[PDB]
Design a protein around this ligand. Structure first.
Ligand SMILES: CNC(=O)CN1C[C@@H](C(=O)Nc2cncc3ccc(NS(C)(=O)=O)cc23)c2cc(Cl)ccc2C1=O
Ligand SMILES: CNC(=O)CN1C[C@@H](C(=O)Nc2cncc3ccc(NS(C)(=O)=O)cc23)c2cc(Cl)ccc2C1=O
Ligand SMILES: [Cl-]
Lengths: 305, 305
């Protein structure tokens, strides 16, 4: 019993974190096999950040301008190349701690663990989700660039995010490990803003199923809804549209609890109308949207209370 | 910017987790140097748990009855002994991954990271607080016994909790690493219940300071209070008493934000008496009490391990 915001154990990723320095700029890098991946803006000064020409800045660097430190050991850079917004530094030593890994690009609503790092040293681990507006609500200070997001379903690490910047609202933007940004953001200090964010409807439904599994039903009602009528109401509360894919994805949780997806949709409609009336659901007074259907099945028991 | 429930990086602890089996019972063990620590109830069957005589059950067990598995390697048990509610299995190999460590007993209100394990394999990491009623609101399924709680200071792991059981309300109970239970609990299947819980006042104040540091200031007011008048209010809302030690501990946060501790108490009193009025603080509609003053300073400064 219980339901916590749970991160994956971070050990496999801690063994990959290194410090990358280029002149006055220091940030984090991810060392896998003989390559160190890091944000390409490590080659920028504060005066280069408005309209950097990364190709022109990079051609002026040699391998020995990149200082890479793994623990108390200096690695030797023997090559470099840029792939989109990521810099790949070839080093003369393969990381002996390289886990089994993949690079995966995720979609909004997906969750992942973040290992926040500073100067190549891990400081903490937390769970988060790719918001519908492609930002993440992380906890990052100056020097955290290059910190990564990942999942570890089984013993293979799937790297999905590399941290690049903080927007004016305090939210964060970054790329996949191939250097493609999530969202309409650029690695420039030009005026940029997060678009209006919305609630991840499929995740809220998954978390309501988690509450039923853990033994709570106060929020259920005797009603059902059509998918279209649910979407017409939920969009008035800035909730993302629920698609037939989302309904299909919630099937296993529906079969486990005995509550049809559209019946859970009616409960959500009523919660949005009434609020909680002094009650909580899984220790929260707000509707939680950073647990996916996959997270709920992984964390909860297979026997409903 | 941002403020997340953040756990310590778990790598140093992941390298210590093993699987302990005795008969039909399988649970987790902690391998440090040449000793494996685990709950003494691993020697119990479901019938024995009703009223176990652990010395009598232990005397029949030989070293070979304990099956200890570290990864895909079977360790050899060469001795066994009990210390309070923990079983110590002497093994023929010192753990090469043993970090610098200490065993520390924590007090209610203190926080720690939990590495949830099943079959000696870590599955997740989450942050939690020892409640004033000595339970923890964890997330644990059958097979999680022996999972541990810890903090990190510099490069030293301080082990503070070992998981033993789940109470009827779904909350959890366990021991320190010397086998002394936190709370008035015993390791047997018998009628046991968590006492009435209270809110950790010093931690709520720390989290209000974190919200201010992050730009959430709507709850601030011009008023102050005496410590005695505040504690009358705290008693009324089932909040723990605030001591002069708590006020002293919040000193640095008070000096950083410009809000005296008793000034923040006046904000807390108004929040208890009037609610949030549809507003949130750090994305929560409830007053959060699982961040200590030290956690707030650490996360708002980027301390690494
Ligand atoms: C808030 N940021 C800024 O005012 C300056 N800024 C620097 C940099 C950037 O966002 N770094 C940061 C990353 N994560 C958390 C941070 C918390 C705080 C912080 N503060 S600071 C020292 O004043 O920038 C910087 C942080 C950046 C990188 C790229 Cl690729 C694009 C744009 C920028 C940029 O605008
Ligand atoms: C809720 N538990 C029970 O009804 C039976 N029970 C077993 C055991 C115990 O609490 N283990 C568990 C620990 N953590 C999470 C658990 C989730 C689920 C779970 N399910 S079960 C197998 O069907 O009880 C057991 C869990 C235990 C150990 C001690 Cl030292 C003392 C008493 C007990 C005890 O009463
Ligand atoms: Cl995805």
């Amino acid at each position: 019993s219980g339901f916590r915001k749970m991160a994956f154990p971070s050990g496999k990723v801690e063994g990959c974190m290194v410090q990358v320095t280029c002149g006055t700029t220091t940030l984090n890098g991810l060392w896998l096999d003989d390559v160190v991946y890091c944000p390409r803006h490590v080659i920028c000064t504060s005066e280069d950040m408005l309209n950097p020409n990364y190709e022109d800045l990079l051609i002026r660097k040699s391998n020995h301008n990149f200082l890479v430190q793994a623990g108390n050991v200096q690695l030797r850079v023997i090559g470099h190349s840029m792939q989109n917004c990521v810099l790949k530094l070839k080093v003369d030593t393969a990381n002996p701690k390289t886990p089994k890994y993949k690079f995966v690009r995720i979609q909004p609503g997906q969750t992942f663990s973040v290992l926040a790092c500073y100067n190549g040293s891990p400081s903490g681990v937390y769970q988060c989700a790719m918001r519908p507006n492609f930002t993440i609500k992380g906890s990052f200070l100056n020097g955290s660039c290059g910190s990564v997001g990942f999942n570890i379903d089984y013993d293979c690490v799937s790297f999905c995010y590399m941290h690049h910047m903080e927007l004016p609202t305090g939210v964060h933007a970054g790329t996949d490990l191939e250097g493609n940004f999530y969202g309409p953001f650029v690695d420039r200090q030009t005026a940029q803003a997060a678009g209006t964010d919305t609630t991840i409807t499929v995740n809220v439904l998954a978390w309501l199923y988690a509450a039923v599994i853990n033994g709570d039903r106060w929020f259920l009602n005797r009603f059902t809804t059509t998918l279209n009528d649910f979407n017409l109401v939920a969009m008035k509360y800035n909730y993302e549209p629920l698609t037939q894919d989302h309904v299909d994805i919630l099937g296993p949780l529906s079969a486990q609890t005995g509550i049809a997806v559209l019946d859970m949709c009616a409960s959500l409609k009523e919660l949005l109308q009434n609020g909680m009336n002094g009650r909580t659901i899984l220790g929260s007074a707000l509707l939680e949207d950073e647990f996916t259907p996959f997270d709920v099945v992984r964390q909860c028991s297979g026997v409903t209370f």
